[PDB]
Design a protein around this ligand. Structure first.
Ligand code: 78M
Ligand code: 78M
Ligand code: 78M
Ligand code: 78N
Ligand code: 78N
Ligand code: 78N
Ligand code: 78N
Ligand code: LDA
Ligand code: LDA
Ligand code: LDA
Ligand code: LDA
Ligand code: LDA
Ligand code: LDA
Ligand code: LDA
Ligand code: LDA
Ligand code: CA
Ligand code: CA
Length: 466
């Protein structure tokens, strides 16, 4: 069920001989996830800077261990990566990564005895946190998190904070993560079969300090401290369920962001960046995300989406931002494969950003899936920047047109052997997959002259679970 240690993994693979493969088998006490990835990326800066190009290959080995004793259980997953350059082998992301490294990915203890519900448990340690949209949390982080998942009622509550990367190559935390504590919760109900309504809350509190006036500031220093609360409502009808039987699936969510930020101000003095003070101000921002998916027949689906995170406003009060724990990856095209909601290439954060999206998808049982996604992006306020994105180039003042993107994701799932056999029958539950995942980004007028006319980021992933 939902407490299984691989429940949230996007791959959805089942090892041969596991209890999930055959309910007569005992739960596995250990296993190995193997990933081989190639990445082609050109060019993250749109040709405005040296570097920013990848054409490289890597292997990622993820052994794991699991123990269960009554209501207690424990889990560890490690990671070893070797690659020809610093590629992305992990969609979930002294800050220079090495080509090769070791990591402690997950380590937690879990207690399920507070209630008799198997859907209820308490988990403590570095753990996968995820909700279905991927827009609030989808990350491995140190946390204490309570989950309650039953037919009529779902609820969660937890607290989380990064203390290390637990990596051999990254010495320090990203500044936004340093001394930031997250508290969060959600409650939702299935008010009709396959229709869910819920509320969600998240609070992020920065206990750090900003550099004082006259101090040099570098990439490891914070740009702001905040106390931010997100309050959201969400309605879904099989939004992220690739096995829906309904002719139509939908999601609608609205989120208010309130609180305050202390923003560091700086000036450049002799190749240096020097702190000049700080400015505080309230945040009163809003985000929405809507989508509708047509289940045309057993194999074909298509749909449309719209999202907007506010931007600008009086002294930047209307600049929406996400929690910083999000992936923005979800099953919104209606397939077993998760897709970046705002482009594999652009990788937009919902922040001073408006996006319109169209997709079509195709799937065949548990054996194949494919999605084609089109996005158009605009700035909401053409003098404010946007949030994070997979594009590292300056925006020109006064231009709303961010660009357009076309994404393709194609996946083959299989079981027996290293690679599929053409004589193999349709797989009941696959243990391995091969995937192409690619995005083509066409910059719009906001990127100005001297930039490339197109950018791409594409991956081939081979994944095996043993
Ligand atoms: C707060 C962080 C918690 C970190 C806990 C990490 C635990 C790592 C791996 C889980 C395996 C626990 C040991 C299993 C064991 O010794 O015996 C059980 C197993 O061999 C048969 O049931
Ligand atoms: C096993 C049951 C655990 C019960 C503990 C419940 C923990 C308490 C609240 C969880 C919901 C998140 C609350 C968010 C919050 O407190 O911040 C809101 C505040 O910042 C508004 O200004
Ligand atoms: C209808 C297809 C829309 C989605 C297209 C996404 C695929 C993006 C690129 C194609 C993958 C090939 C990657 C290799 C490549 O393009 O050449 C390397 C590059 O540096 C110069 O082209
Ligand atoms: C039931 C007890 C079993 C204990 C399992 C230990 C697993 C073995 C090694 C995991 C290493 C844990 C990560 C430690 C670590 O990386 O610390 C990082 C430092 O703080 C510097 O970043
Ligand atoms: C094929 C083996 C796969 C198993 C890999 C498990 C690796 C377990 C723990 C490695 C993480 C330990 C990090 C230790 C460390 O020194 O990190 C801190 C560095 O000094 C960065 O400043
Ligand atoms: C970039 C990918 C292409 C995006 C396509 C987006 C299209 C949005 C919605 C498609 C609606 C599908 C309607 C299907 C339909 O009407 O079939 C009717 C049949 O005749 C029923 O018998
Ligand atoms: C580019 C590197 C390899 C990437 C592999 C990604 C997935 C590969 C192939 C998917 C092919 C999709 C067409 C499937 C199809 O037409 O039907 C399959 C048959 O019905 C069953 O054999
Ligand atoms: C679809 C994108 C994945 C294909 C890219 C494969 C790259 C193989 C070349 C590895 C050599 C890299 N290099 C030149 C730095 O050594
Ligand atoms: C399988 C391909 C993995 C490539 C690892 C390459 C590591 N190294 C040092 C040669 O770059
Ligand atoms: C069996 C070879 C072990 C290689 C371990 C992975 C890379 C070495 C650690 C480098 C630090 C980053
Ligand atoms: C505050 C967030 C709670 C952290 C809970 C997990 C801590 C255990 C991992 C640290 C070693
Ligand atoms: C506003 C209400 C947000 C729901 C949080 C409650 C979590 C339940 C424990
Ligand atoms: C509006 C969201 C309501 C969530 C359901 C919580 C109470 C269940 C009856
Ligand atoms: C979006 C649709 C949500 C409907 C609200 C729940 C009604 C309860 C009967
Ligand atoms: C569950 C309710 C979903 C709310 C989404 C409604 C769209 C927001 C329109 C706000 C206009 C400003
Ligand atoms: Ca470049
Ligand atoms: Ca329980």
């Amino acid at each position: 069920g939902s407490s299984h240690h691989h429940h949230h993994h996007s791959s959805g693979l089942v090892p041969r001989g596991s209890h999930m493969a055959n309910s007569g088998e005992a739960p596995k006490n250990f296993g190995l996830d193997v990933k081989i990835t190639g990445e082609s990326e050109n060019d993250r800066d749109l040709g405005t800077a040296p570097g920013g190009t990848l054409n490289d290959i890597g292997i990622d080995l993820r052994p794991w261990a699991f123990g269960q004793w009554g209501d207690w259980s424990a889990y560890f997953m490690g990671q070893a990566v070797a690659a020809t350059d610093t590629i992305e082998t992990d969609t979930l992301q002294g800050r220079e990564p090495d080509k090769s490294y070791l990591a402690a990915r997950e380590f937690w203890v879990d207690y399920a005895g507070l209630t008799a519900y198997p859907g209820e448990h308490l988990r403590f340690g570095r753990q996968r946190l995820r909700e279905d949209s991927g827009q609030w949390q989808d990350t491995n982080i140190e946390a204490l998190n309570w989950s309650f998942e039953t037919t009529l009622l779902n609820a969660h509550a937890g607290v989380a904070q990064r203390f290390s990367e637990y990596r051999t190559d990254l010495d320090e935390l990203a500044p936004e993560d340093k001394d930031r504590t997250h508290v969060f919760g959600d409650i939702s109900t299935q008010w009709a079969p396959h229709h869910r309504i819920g509320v969600r809350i998240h609070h992020a509190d920065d206990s750090g300090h900003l550099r004082r006036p006259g101090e040099e500031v570098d990439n490891l220093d914070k740009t702001y401290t905040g106390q931010l609360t997100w309050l959201g409502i969400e309605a879904t009808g099989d939004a992220y369920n690739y096995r829906s039987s309904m002719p139509l699936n939908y999601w609608a969510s609205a989120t208010w962001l309130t609180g305050d930020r202390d923003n560091l101000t700086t000036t450049t003095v002799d190749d240096r960046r020097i702190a000049t003070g700080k400015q505080s101000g309230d945040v009163n921002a809003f985000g929405v995300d809507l989508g509708l998916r047509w289940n045309i027949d057993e194999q074909w689906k298509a749909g449309v989406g719209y999202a907007r995170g506010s931007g600008g406003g009086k002294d930047g009060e209307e600049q929406f931002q996400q929690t910083g724990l999000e992936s923005n990856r979800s099953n919104f095209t209606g397939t077993r494969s998760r897709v970046h909601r705002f482009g594999e290439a652009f990788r937009g954060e919902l922040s001073n950003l408006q996006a319109a999206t169209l997709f079509g998808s195709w799937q065949l049982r548990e054996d194949y899936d494919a999605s084609l996604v089109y996005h158009k992006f605009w700035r909401v306020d053409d003098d404010s920047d946007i949030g994070t994105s997979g594009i590292n180039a300056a925006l020109q003042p006064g231009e709303k047109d961010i660009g357009q993107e076309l994404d393709l994701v194609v996946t083959k799932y299989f079981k027996q052997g290293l690679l599929p056999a053409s004589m193999s029958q349709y797989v009941d539950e696959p243990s391995a997959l091969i995937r192409f995942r690619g995005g083509l980004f066409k910059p719009g007028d906001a990127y100005g002259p001297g930039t490339d006319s197109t950018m791409h980021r594409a991956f081939v992933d081979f994944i095996w679970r043993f």
